[model samples]
Target: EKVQAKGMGFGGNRKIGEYQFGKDLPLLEITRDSSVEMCFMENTDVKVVDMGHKYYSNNKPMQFTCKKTYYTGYSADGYDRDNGAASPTNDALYAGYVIKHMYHDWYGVEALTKSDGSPMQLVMRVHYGQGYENAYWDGKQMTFGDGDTMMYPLVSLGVGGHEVSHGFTEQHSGLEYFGQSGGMNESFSDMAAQAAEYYSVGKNSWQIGPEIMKEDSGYDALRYMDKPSRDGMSIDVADDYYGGLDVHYSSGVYNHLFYILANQPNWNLRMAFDVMVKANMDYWTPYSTFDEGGCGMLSAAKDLGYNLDDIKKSLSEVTINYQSCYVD
Candidate 1:
């Protein structure tokens, strides 16, 4: 019954190889495509790919050798049983693939531009350290780690989407990571991850990182979208929200709202995500509140040719700080 939806199945169907999304999710059949070349020093301008790379290190190595990485086909998603070295080729390719889908393939949400209006290139570094259990996005780039015992390698689709989305958020709104605005920042990244994962698996699980979870972690996923309270940390209702809550937990409010909007009859996740990205890019600010976010989403949805009344219905369900000029 999980995959009962007629048009829903594993998204990609390549004939060459089959790889699991992670230990817990469906198989994503991938093809044996030629690798895309990304560069380093002495070759910066020749074949400038989407990203550059480095070893996640401590001394941080003042002087480092320039290297090239090829994004090619691989078997594993985040497994490294022999050594916890994260899969570089597969991880890089998967990240690039998702960004391409978001910007060019499934949707036309273009890549964020730098100050010069040129497309911003990214720097991604994975395989952070031994038993490193988290993934993060600094202002400049992304970093991933191999899990010790509780989590999987932090390079799954959600990690790609989430960390990369942080770059988007930082460049766009610069939401302060202190209180409610920080919550919006986290929720925005979560929503983007949902869209990226849907683009990857051809289904909407409304989950964050179920794909990269170890079996005995005492949880199904790193976070839940449909029902954020399932994790016992995130609150689903608007009434339960407060100003001083941590961003990750406070993210539940808007995340649940996005879930409601996406799961509504006849509305797809991609469409919902398109509206969200539009709001974040065109309508939001550093301190946009949930009420303002709801208004922005409503305006964005209408501008994007969606049913305003149906979207209003979902927005009304949240009720916490919900506001709009359109009458219901």
Candidate 2:
């Protein structure tokens, strides 16, 4: 086998012996006569081609020109090992893959073509510093730390979906992160994560970090869809026990509000939002932030079920400020 040279471009900078999408090098062509031996043999040419260097002849980086994929494929669904120095870069590329594919599935070809109609390459970096316990997107790229094995995977798809949703949310509502508005921002992240998860793995019951956490014990991080505050350090839903609560602390109020608005129940998580009442993800669609989404949910509830005077009053009374929204 022989190797060939090609040019690979990164914003017009060229590299030698590099290949990019859409270009291939010519190889020696084989003329086939009637096969007599190996094609019919047990240890056969039909099985493995001893194509050594030929495999890399036209090899290029796996790409997302039209929606590509990148996965850790370590554990069933999550990245298994600590990449340490490489974690940030690794998770960013992986999350970018999910974002590109999700946008394609949701919006089609136009999704890849930006509002200005130019191709943009979404890049990611993973394997942040050592023993890093969290993941985040710092304006430009997403980063991840290897989570403690018994607890979490640094690169949960839900987390990835959450970060991507933050980018989307920032682009849209610009929901003020003060009081109710800040809580709304968090809820939107959770809600958008749910949408992305459902869209990817349907009928899986909207469990976040399902693939990341320890399976035997059944502990879920963040809010409970049913109880909201069942777990410690989580905000309780619909609690107005005290006035002037911290909006960040008051997020449970609106997480509950989200459940209420999305038609998700407060009753032990038994029934999903739609099965019990007049709500659907469709109700929450087109909403960029919680305030706008609250309005939509309010309208959907009135349109679909009993017109409750209290519900309308609730929306009006709750300011976009999170603490103000939780007027307990």
Candidate 3:
């Protein structure tokens, strides 16, 4: 019922169609000239644009029609793509549409406004490689795979939101790429991803990657926010044991922290996102620890005129260096 980039940006707020619009971004689409290999490649001929429909690209666009072959360099012809076409085009168009709209409303146009109120410029790509199994943001753009063709399309709303959130984290916080700081980086992406999904759909289950994960009686997602330990791979609190955890697994602590704080009585996720973006842009640095990041978020919430004493108390209960937050 809710129409969503059936694929493809710059900056200004203009509605591209009855169903889609953005402020000050490009309007051209491009296709790949050949099939993809096992790894990501650059400078392929697939980067050519198709201006006949008024589209643009920074990277090759891809599509899988529920067929064996994966194609690149195609754009959807119209704004409404929910007519139930099972082609890879459907996934490409649908996922691209959502990503572009999210960029317009959530991060790119509004979040990147310079001190002079001019929009900062950025580009993103959403690619679906042949039978690949995941989605990622590679410091420059975002890409999605076909999920091995057994689970849900990796291009679903939540996955797209999660990957794009990575771009936002890189743009705003610039969090370092490893250890506890890396964990915080991953958590912010998860937080922003959930926030974007909530903004688009009006509701969410607070789970990550549900659409592309196989649903079984006992397992349902790549990660759980309410209780991260349910995944058997993520930690729920900070501990010295974190020394060996991967960034994705270590992110569980902060992810659960954000979930608890955002869902506090009378607090909505929109408010939570506002608080986070403020903290990320104004308070955090590349090397901030979880405790410091928590302090920044609490401070931002206080500045926003919210009484979140419970949130602070809860964060202090689990974080090791949270007392250092008093410097703010």
Candidate 4:
């Protein structure tokens, strides 16, 4: 487990606790006026520290502050560090703990916080080793397995974002996870993950993992934001065609749409990602589903006063951009 503020600045306190330790879920407590304390349990030692609940507004331009110097080490009957077999090295696990926070913090620098100005915390759990080549999220926490190293790293941030986005989906649109609606749910997850990717590394590319997957995996690594079908080839153009490929293959459409919505390199884009992001968050923060998602996105666009014409054009572009065709 680990601790973090939803986004940068400083609005709330987050924590990761072991079973042997107390306070596993921060949201479970009626925290007010102060943050709860916890520990960073390692394989050989233990360090304890207080995580203050007093958070500041990230947008308020406050001075830098931290409660530095806590605790770390190992403990028996501790938290489930060894999740099955996809066990990550202490360094990898800890790095994930810290990286998740840092990644969100980096995005928070420009993200919109809750009404109270607090960023939302996200927790991820990995390690389903022993040749379990798949990963999934149970509508809340995300768990992963080390893919056959020849294919990918189950712990890659992109995949983390992908799985975490599912929780977001369950919260927002609550899109049915199967059928046409399910496909929509899957597409939105890819869209959210790609947006998260851009925010995480602050780069603009259709490629999902120029750093993780090997070059010959045929799966196109992950999804492509630029003309996604250029790689997936299964997106449909008919009104009745609610695209139906594997979530990964079908995800490309929305991924490409998000890229278009971003209008990357266009100086006038003006943080449009924020609008789409908030729209996505607006729904996922509390609901889920394709209908709810559609309504949620439309609602967000209206709320942000985003140009519907732009959305129309983007969708149209995605529909007709079929030069890169293949159904695989």
Candidate 5:
């Protein structure tokens, strides 16, 4: 089936690919040219071709095959693992594919290309282990675990987006993996990840990892953007964060700040996305602080010709202290 890449700048061009959006999910399929032969196909820009499963232990990766196509094939309604019709491997791959496409397309392909002007390539590994409860980016590729399959799937779209955003941050700012810089690192990932969900599914709950949360669990999501302190482990105040807490939890301060800006009446998600990307790609340094990040956003807004009176007032109310990082 033909799948059209959907985003801000796409002009309804059709691409020969093995994936499509299913009602509210992604359908993984192998295209057939009116015959029974399997065809490998995709568009020029982004690809999500590799997907596999691994044992619960540290072992070699295993590739899954569809009964008919011997690879990811089309199934009714997209999700087919329930009836043993298809492997959930495609689900993860398609989710990553869609999220990555959203970022690359929305930001423009060149925004993420390498310094050499080559397209950035992303590889996703899903079903990494049995009963594993999480996912991460290993500096080279994206990996997802099974998460026991009861509470959640490791390949949640938002989580996949988060992992992909890590690669973007690493290449852009080279944020030090500790201190305030580290907090910004995690916050950027969270912001972009959640933004992908918003653009794709119109989810505006300001919660991350809701799809992966346990069923009947009282908690809303893995993290709360409106009030990060609801998690009890995350801090919303910049000065309140110390070196002891994990960067993920400490990221709440900047994450909530970004949430505020993204939801403001004066700003939209797209503008917020460009603002954060500009801050990271053009302004931030290895040792930058939260204040510096705020200044970066403020500067990026001005450069983009966005009115910033309300943004400046709101940022100052949070003690961002933009003047300290502002350059005259």
Candidate 6:
């Protein structure tokens, strides 16, 4: 449930609740006013404090002004967090928009169902906690954290799309959240995030969380696709991958492969995204390895009438074989 904004600003004639939350589907608008006003639920033990009229404009200059605190609070009556929209409050609309983009904009997304032919509507909440820093899809709904000093807006186009892609990974491949499969899960999420961004703003920075990360932090983004290692942690090559590494870092290999493919003479970002989405839903498995994932993409490219040579070439850069398929 969301509460409406009263007033917010550093400037004159300021407002907050410009957009509304959706139940049947996602609304088109993505950005929200950064100047948040505190409004909590009175029913439950919802402890929400006024985050104040703080407005942060990221490098993208998108406002992170949280207008309403959509805190569900602690409800005892079967956890009814979905009380929803009694006032003119602004809810996190980006996640829902991202899901809709995948479901409607992409080709293979019609298959993005719960089990099959069952449409899955996304439920999202933003401005979660005071200076909280993170976003996740927990097998049911998406929860977004208001980042701390180092970060402000945890929910952005790329990041929102990334979280929902995790839902895609679970519904289709059921990729185990560990090791190579985990990295694949994270990698596809990043790619899908980029796809949503490209489809929306017509820009592909190939950087994750730039819309949310603080510029003063001296880091360009939370993760980089063109140079995964730019963040000092991601591994852009297969040789640098292993089960011990964090899935976030290990995801660099596939992300780099995507970057290379998009920059290749015969390839484009949309084509890569199409094959990846198609392959993920049909080809990837519970414990698919990097090489296996590559093979899946290769197979998908061929089936989808994409340039197979480009797929092979892009995967080869990471030593991932498109010519071979892994049975296990």
Scored by TM-score, the top model is 5
TM-score of 3: 0.69
Q: Compared with the true structure, what per-residue lDDT tens digits does model 6 show for residues 1-328?
A: 3333222211000111123233322322322233343223211111112223232212121123232223222221111121121111122343455456555766736323566556665545554555667878788555666566666555555766788778878888888888998998899889988888788657777988776666566765789999899899999888888759999999999999999988889678988888888888789899998988888887788788988777777788887754557332
How would you order the candidates by TM-score, starting with the best? 5, 1, 6, 3, 4, 2
Task: Estimate the lDDT of model 6.
Answer: 0.62
Q: lDDT for every model? A: 0.61, 0.39, 0.56, 0.42, 0.63, 0.62
State the displacement of the C-alpha of residue 271, model 6, in Å, after optimal TM-score superposition.
0.4
Ten contiguous residues with the weakest lDDT in model 3: 39-48
Task: Give the clashing residue pairs of candidate 6, or none.
Answer: 3-89, 4-88, 4-89, 33-65, 34-64, 34-65, 35-65, 36-66
Q: Count the clashes in each prediction.
A: 0, 19, 27, 25, 0, 8
Alpha-carbon shift of residue 173 in model 4 (angstroms): 1.7
Best by lDDT: 5
Model 3 / residue 156 / CA error / Å: 1.9
> Distance (Å) between predicted and true CA of 282, model 5?
0.8
Candidate 5 contains a number of clashing pairs equal to 0
lDDT of 2 by residue, 1-328 (tens): 2111211111100111122212232111111113221110001000111111121212122221110112222221222223221222223333444555665565342112334655334422333444455655454334455455434435544667666555554444455555555665565555545655555545333434444444444664544543456655546544342445554455665555545534423322112222212222333333334445555545555564534444544444443332322332
lDDT of 5 at 157: 58
Pairwise TM-score winner, candidates 1 and 3: 1
RMSD of each: 9.1, 14.5, 10.1, 12.3, 6.8, 10.3
lDDT tens digits by residue: candidate 3, 191-271: 866866676667777888765555442457878988898899898888633576898899898888777777778777777
Candidate 1 lDDT over 1-328, as tens digits, reads 0111000011111111224333324322122212322112111101112122324343121111111122122222233231232333344445645654575565554444577656655444555666677878777667766566777666656777787788788777677776767887899889888777678667656888776666566767878988898988998866787877788998998898889888789987887888888888788778877777787888888789998776778777776545444344
Sequence-dependent TM-score of model 5: 0.78
TM-score of predicted structure 6: 0.72
TM-score for every candidate vs. truth?
0.75, 0.51, 0.69, 0.57, 0.78, 0.72
RMSD of 6: 10.3
In model 1, residue pairs whose N, Cα or C atoms come closer than 3 Å (at least 3 residues apart or on different chains), thus clashing, are none
